[PDB]
Design a protein around this ligand. Structure first.
Ligand SMILES: Nc1ncnc2c1ncn2[C@@H]1O[C@H](COP(=O)(O)OP(=O)(O)OP(O)(O)=S)[C@@H](O)[C@H]1O
Ligand SMILES: Nc1ncnc2c1ncn2[C@@H]1O[C@H](COP(=O)(O)OP(=O)(O)OP(O)(O)=S)[C@@H](O)[C@H]1O
Ligand SMILES: [Mg+2]
Ligand SMILES: [Mg+2]
Ligand SMILES: [Zn+2]
Lengths: 322, 432, 432, 432, 119, 75, 119
DNA sequence: TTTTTTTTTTTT
DNA sequence: GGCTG
């Protein structure tokens, strides 16, 4: 198919749609908009469940409200035949910033031992030394607007735990804020100094031997050579130590997305971790530590004797499925 | 002028009586117009009357439409009004609009077809017509008109019937008088003639005999052989015309001197045409390839045929359907339609030879329920004959013709007659 | 829809007299519509007549309603429509509305019954029906139909049935006295009637004679031909109607002047019908293609026939069998059933012809046992007339008509009769 | 691929001699490609030869272009090399490119015609054709195949045809005088020959007899077994060649001395060929496997077989159709077509067996209709003989061979002849 | 060593004669290598000859896969180049590679069958 | 069904497929009539004999004993 | 269901008679389950009778492992109870468990063989 | 929509 | 703030 011309035609046709958004990352062409087929959610007028994907082999539209999915050509012919004919004829026609200041931030290692967040991190059972990499803020929106103005409409006083993300050079080019309260718009609000900032945590702290890729940076704290891809799309290329890295996901065997990711990793022949014999059964490492009492050295012992790759990984995954 | 068309469908009766049977949902844009026409058509199908504005507003409320579609339909219904105009400009304007919409739809369909064809196999859409089907679609769109003839109306179409009585179509005579008797003077120009027969019973023998007979009458004959080499067909023709058996030619009984003398004696005769034999691989030729062959024959040899002969219909390519897409019946019917269209376009008598089913083999009588590949061939054909040399006709050096479908005359007059097939000379002689 | 229902209750008579007995207060709403209908019902009860707008407003003024109810009723009364919608659509739509509202009310009632059932027995309403009454309640919701006509009810439709026997509502005369005598007034609508032809008996002569006779009596005739073209069948029709011999047309004895004069003389007569001749290939017309042809003729030609004449039953194709045979019993039985179903569903007299058994061919007498179609045609045919042509009858220009199956009347009343067949004009004349 | 087309136009005479006849400026582009082709066409018109790079550059200097077009043409001309690609792929690819560009141009032309038609008559251009020219425009763009050969002429090529009559290199003798007599010189290369009979009648016996007869004539024979093992069939070939028995081999009546003496005596003969026996599991081979087997045989040993014997076509597996995708009439015919294509590609005589349905397993005669698998096999076949054995025949050890489909010669000259089949020796013996 | 195998399938008639009968599409990769081999196999089935670089580029342009796949195939084709080699080392190495890929596919299918039957 | 209670059974009497005789090395037909049953014998006919010539010794009478489920020869 | 299997090996008798011959130390685990089964098998080999819980504690005391796993083993033998389950279900579930573990071990073994062949 | 095996049934 | 096939 012809992705670029389809993307252009979809852009022309859907420029006028409600909630139209040009959600285009560095490698994908997605358009977010309110689904004209169903008007998206009747209750929520700000929902834009109409999505066009040009990254797909053929730019395809799908609504998450009316569950209407089709190619761009089908929608164009069934809704705008006028430009559809011109498009179908065209078918054969073609034929960096570094964060330097920490306003309203007090590092946990230098924070007072009586601070409530210190007590919470004790409930989180984080190693004391790791506190020299985490700050606490009472003015997270204020701090972000001080560093990146216009981010927050109001600089409300919100206490969060700020983990700066240091590049291999050790330069904080981003930061993730964890809301202390159980209720929040997002558990981990991550803001980067520049769009090309590193999405991998602990890169500056990588040592010799195998490197363990985890989910949460706090989880990586308990682990030597623990790096954390800070959200985003899992891309092998952006990940260093492509020779020696070790994949460690959450212990959620019945969860479908986790096993999908693990299948993706193993099909790339990677070296992954398996929990099919873990004495603890919590979802993640920190949960095993705080609940099952799991201690980090036992965890490392288990993991160094549970890494599998290739056919070994595949067969050990089959059993771990369910 | 969709709004005017809908308004005068709702508010006018003579306009509705004149234009409704020809309107279709595909003639309207996918916005409010198509949905409003859907409501009107559903109401007419359910109650056999033209709906009012209240009926449609009731039908709109009792419909599964989105908010945008509902708003568009309601706005379009509100905008409808009975503008007084003349019932001679409305009909012609509606006809023009319908023709334009049909042409637009045909253009979109062919543009899509071309896009589908260039796709690699195992990804391209199936059941979608190939590139060779493009002109036929464009022939259908131009035929849209608000005038329709369904059957012959007595007392309403009687001038044409009198013309048919008094006038007779031109006929290309045969050389066998029996065929002229059963066809009232021969075969017409734009026709598809088929000589069905069993396997190895004389399909090519009869076609080569016809080719020789037409060549002796001064016609330009094109023999498209899809199964045999050019030299083999030309040797059959030589045996027919030089009165030498195929055994004599193969064994070398005749010398080059006698062969050259006979060929030059035939050349010196003024009442001789030109026969050109073209061989194509099995499944490698279609109607478009035949048209290219005709174009190159006219341009490079100054040759315009009249008696185009295809050795076997079942081997040729569909030209409208992709290979191995539909069943044998549909593909063979499409081939027959394409060949008849080619014959009509080129004004050439087209002769072919299909194969009967296994049941008809060694059967003393055959009928229309014996065609192997497709029973739709008689419908497309204009004259169809059969060969019944089963068990004892071969010993008597004879044959039999059933006359399965004869559009030139009446099949039940000389339905079965005996033909003296001579296989050494590859010819038909008459028993008279 | 409620606005339309109330408006046409106020401003109509037939609609009121048709839908008032099936109209209840609970069918409308719990707001302005219910109050307006209560006013209408109160007025019709106190004064047995449909109220007017002024009377309705006076009643609303002298009524116990709050401010919001007063405003709603006033607005609804001011929003009445006197538009004259078609009666059939109005009745059907109000029936659907009533049925939907009744179903909704019954479902709500059974849900409330179930909810009350799951309550402390000491604490429940006594008036609420028990759970066992649920299946009956829904039945009362399903027993709502403005008009109940399921079949023919003996002792409840005897007055309408008598009007059928006196008015001969089903009979279609023949224009031949003998055929009317043995059919008690002609053939009936929704019937299949066939002619059995023995030796020297064409099947299309009798069919063309019947078609001409029906045409002279004012009936719309649809002649579907299989083995012949439209022009040939219409030429047989012309021979019978214009009194010109069939061979005279081909020879040219009759000139254009006489032909046109006779045709215009026939056109002047107001007792003449329309004849539509449609041709189909042999075996290419099942009794589902005929339905499409009828739909096209009704939509485009406005031609709704009362007589349908198929040239030959054997040549037709069984839609149910799909596979086709030249002379197979299973196909003939299916073809007859399909054609009779078409006749019943179209309320038309359907005519066809078949060949008698070989033994029937040799014997002047033809027995139902002596029929090519055994237990297949004398089972699906209301009338089966047999035609016998021997040497002595042919020398006297006659054919012996024998009655082999007569659903209409007694078969043995007048079984044998001599018919004056003219093979040149394709006509049947009576014999004194 | 315009660069490739231009490079092989300039730098290849064979390519120029087959594509230049069909090439236009509209086919290439609107930019540098069209200008380069225009320069080439101008140079070839002014001087009847293919230009060189230096001459093309000099002409470009002489010709006048704007700056952009001049730069584009210079850049394109710089990019021309010999690059000796395959001729067949090159001509096929340029034909595809020409066809797709012609289709694009035709679609644009008809779109322009439609756009001009909608314009008012005053504004519209008179040069553009009417809409009625849309179909043929799309048809002339579907008849642009690359084919300059028109075919035989029968009067301008009778000398070449007579010379072709003397080319008997296709014939392969049979070593049996009766088979040569009925085939007019034996079987021909690239033909599908079939030997059909019932179960346990001697089909593989006849195949092994033919293999031995061809081996004794010096041919290379490739026997492909589908049921039996390699050593079992080689035992039958040994029984035919050494001429002792089948049971005596297994009963020890032949000592190793006599066995060796005979094999070495046959080795000393210079008239002996090479025989390779290959076995395949049932339903696991076709021409695709056979072509790879042929390539491996040619690479490993100096063995190019002239005769290819397939144990049974039915046991074989079709290339495109899966194991049970479609019914027997299709996949069997597909396998037959693939085998004939393989034979005509390798120019080898292909022999195979066929099964007969149960209706003729105990009959004194077998017809062509008695083919157990698809009836398309007796359509792709060329010399389908038949083996019939009865009790009287088995008493005399004389199988009857009936000529079922004879494409080489007259099927009815010697229709039935007796053979002298010796079952112990697996040999066919002629009867005099 | 997929690049070497493809390069000597293109630029070596002796190598193609022995390895081709056995080469299959499931022995290379799920990305550029499989697509390039599919192009080569289609060309061989259509013309019974080994395609050249120009033929591969032409077939690549007349292909329907996405931008990533197109770029990968283009890079792989541009990297194909004949090298001074010896028939034996190549045939043995190709046999080892084909056997290893066959074993890998077999064990993957075995794992798939085991994890499918346990449903 | 047509071969049941018949004095002779042919190869064409195979029930479920005509391909079974084609894909079978050896087949033997067991035939029993009332006379044969009274003689405690069965006629075995060689229908498809791939190990030898079927014309020779085509039909011989085995001495089936139904009580002992045993075949015995008559030689 | 290793806990159920061990508990019904120690306590149940007919289940022990039917299932013991088809028991191997490779079917259970590489942790506390394997150690417990090894202790039970050693005891049944020494004394041709099923051991008791006190006997298991004595065997743990005299025959010791590294404390890291030894704690896990001693906390593994604290849950084995009588739990009179039905015989047919217990046998069927034990058979399914041992079959699954045998398939897993065979797949791991063939993967290791393939890995060794590559070396 | 045809094609081929096998069976079962029925009609002539 | 993402999430489809
Ligand atoms: N060389 C020949 N010499 C004499 N008679 C021949 C020769 N070739 C064919 N015939 C006869 O001609 C008859 C008809 O052959 P064809 O013309 O090929 O009929 P056909 O229907 O075309 O056969 P097909 O195409 O294989 S179904 C055969 O049955 C033979 O008897
Ligand atoms: N070992 C043998 N000794 C003697 N005669 C044999 C032997 N094997 C077969 N025959 C004879 O060969 C005749 C037919 O041979 P076949 O080749 O088996 O026939 P065919 O079954 O058509 O070929 P197939 O099925 O591909 S093996 C049988 O009727 C036997 O008389
Ligand atoms: Mg032929
Ligand atoms: Mg056999
Ligand atoms: Zn939606």
């Amino acid at each position: 198919s012809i992705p670029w011309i389809d993307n252009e035609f979809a852009y022309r046709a859907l420029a006028h749609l409600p909630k139209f958004t040009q959600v285009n990352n560095s490698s994908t062409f997605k358009l977010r908009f309110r689904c004209p087929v169903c008007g998206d959610s009747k209750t929520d007028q700000n929902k834009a469940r109409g999505w066009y994907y040009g990254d797909n082999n053929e730019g395809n539209i799908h609504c998450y409200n009316c569950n209407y999915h089709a190619p761009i050509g089908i929608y164009l012919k069934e809704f705008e035949p006028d430009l559809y004919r011109e498009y179908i004829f065209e078918i054969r026609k073609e034929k960096k910033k570094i964060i330097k200041s920490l306003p309203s931030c007090v590092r946990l290692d230098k924070l007072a031992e009586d601070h409530p967040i210190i007590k919470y991190v004790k409930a989180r059972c984080i190693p004391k030394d790791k506190w020299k990499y985490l700050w606490f803020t009472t003015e997270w929106p204020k701090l972000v607007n001080s560093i990146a103005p216009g981010t927050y409409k109001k600089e409300i006083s919100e206490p969060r735990l700020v983990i700066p993300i240091y590049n291999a050079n050790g330069k904080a080019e981003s930061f993730q804020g964890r809301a202390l309260k159980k209720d929040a718009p997002q558990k981990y609000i991550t803001i980067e100094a520049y769009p090309e900032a590193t999405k991998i945590y602990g890169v500056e702290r990588v040592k010799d031997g195998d490197v363990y890729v985890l989910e949460g940076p706090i989880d990586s704290l308990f682990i030597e050579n623990g790096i954390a891809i800070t959200g985003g799309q899992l891309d092998l290329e952006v990940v260093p130590f492509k020779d020696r890295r070790v994949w460690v996901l959450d212990n959620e065997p019945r969860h479908p997305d986790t096993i999908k990711r693990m299948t993706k990793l193993v099909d790339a022949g990677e070296r992954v971790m398996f929990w099919d014999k873990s004495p603890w059964k919590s979802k993640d490492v920190n949960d095993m530590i705080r609940k099952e009492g799991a201690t980090p050295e036992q965890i490392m012992e288990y993991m160094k004797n549970n890494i599998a790759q290739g056919l070994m990984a595949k067969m050990r995954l089959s059993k771990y499925a369910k | 002028m969709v709004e005017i068309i809908l308004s005068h469908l709702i508010f006018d009766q003579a306009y509705f009586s004149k234009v409704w049977p020809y309107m279709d949902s595909e003639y309207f844009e996918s916005g409010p117009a198509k949905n409003t026409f859907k409501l009107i058509k559903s109401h007419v199908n359910e109650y056999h009357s033209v709906p009012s504005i209240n009926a449609l507003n009731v039908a709109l409320e009792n419909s599964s439409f989105t908010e945008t579609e509902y708003s568009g339909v309601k706005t379009l219904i509100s905008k409808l009004a009975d503008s007084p105009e003349d019932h001679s400009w409305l009909v012609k304007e509606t006809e023009k609009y319908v023709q334009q919409r049909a042409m637009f739809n045909a253009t979109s369909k062919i543009i899509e077809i071309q896009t589908n064809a260039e796709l690699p196999p195992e990804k391209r859409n199936k059941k979608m017509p190939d590139v060779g089907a493009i002109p036929d679609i464009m022939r259908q769109a131009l035929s849209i008109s608000f005038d329709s003839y369904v059957g012959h109306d007595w007392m309403d179409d009687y001038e044409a019937r009198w013309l048919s009585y008094m006038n007779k179509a031109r006929k290309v005579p045969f050389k066998l008088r029996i065929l002229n008797k059963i066809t009232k003077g021969g075969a017409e120009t734009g026709t598809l003639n088929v000589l069905m027969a069993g396997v190895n019973v004389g399909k090519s023998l009869g076609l080569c005999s016809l080719a020789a007979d037409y060549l002796q009458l001064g016609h330009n004959v094109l023999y498209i052989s899809m199964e045999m080499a050019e030299e083999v067909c030309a040797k059959r023709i030589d045996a027919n015309m030089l009165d030498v058996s195929l055994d004599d030619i193969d064994d070398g009984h005749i010398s080059y001197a006698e062969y050259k003398g006979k060929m030059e004696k035939w050349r010196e005769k003024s009442t001789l045409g030109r026969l050109i034999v073209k061989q194509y691989p099995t499944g490698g030729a279609d109607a478009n390839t035949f048209r290219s062959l005709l174009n190159e024959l006219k341009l490079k040899k100054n040759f315009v045929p009249t008696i185009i002969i295809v050795d076997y219909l079942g081997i040729c390519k569909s030209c409208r359907i992709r290979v191995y897409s539909e069943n044998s019946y549909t593909t063979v019917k499409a081939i027959a339609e394409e060949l008849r269209a080619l014959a009509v376009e080129t004004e050439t008598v087209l002769w072919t030879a299909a194969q009967v089913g296994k049941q008809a083999w060694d059967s003393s009588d055959v009928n229309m329920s014996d065609i192997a590949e497709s029973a739709g061939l008689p419908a497309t054909a204009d004259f169809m004959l059969a060969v019944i040399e089963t068990e004892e006709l071969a010993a008597a050096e004879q044959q039999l013709i059933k006359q399965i479908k004869s559009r030139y005359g009446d099949k039940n007059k000389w339905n079965k007659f005996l033909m003296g097939v001579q296989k050494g000379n590859q010819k038909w002689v008459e028993i008279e």
